[PDB]
Amino acid sequence: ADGAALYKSCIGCHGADGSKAAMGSAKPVKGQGAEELYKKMKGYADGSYGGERKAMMTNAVKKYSDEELKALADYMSKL
């Protein structure tokens, strides 16, 4: 569905421009790279990836699925 809409909640930690180094100190999500973003989201979706707050991430990400994840990464890749 619309990546921007799906990411609306995420914007809370990542910042409006997805550049706020989210809580732990996320690498600015803004333009991380769609492939990157998606590979990592899939990773958290299934649980085969980590980070400072990988758990929070996984829990959030769980809401989506491959299509929604692709859209989210596509959005985050432009931000």
- Residues near ligand HEC (CB under 6 A) are 7, 9-10, 12-14, 22-24, 26-27, 29, 32, 37, 40-41, 51-54, 56-57, 60-61, 72, 76
56 labeled part of a ligand binding site: no
13 in a known ligand binding site: yes
41 is in an annotated binding site: no
User: Least distance (Å) from ligand HEC to the CB of residue 17?
Assistant: 14
Residue 57 annotated as lining a ligand binding site: yes
Here the contacts of 33-41 (C-beta below 8 Å, separation 24 or greater) are: 33/77, 34/73, 34/74, 34/76, 34/77, 35/73, 36/73, 37/72, 37/73, 37/76, 37/77, 38/69, 38/70, 38/73, 41/69, 41/72, 41/73
In whole angstroms, the minimum distance from the beta carbon of 7 to ligand HEC comes to 6
**Sequence ranges of the binding site for heme c:** 10, 13-14, 57
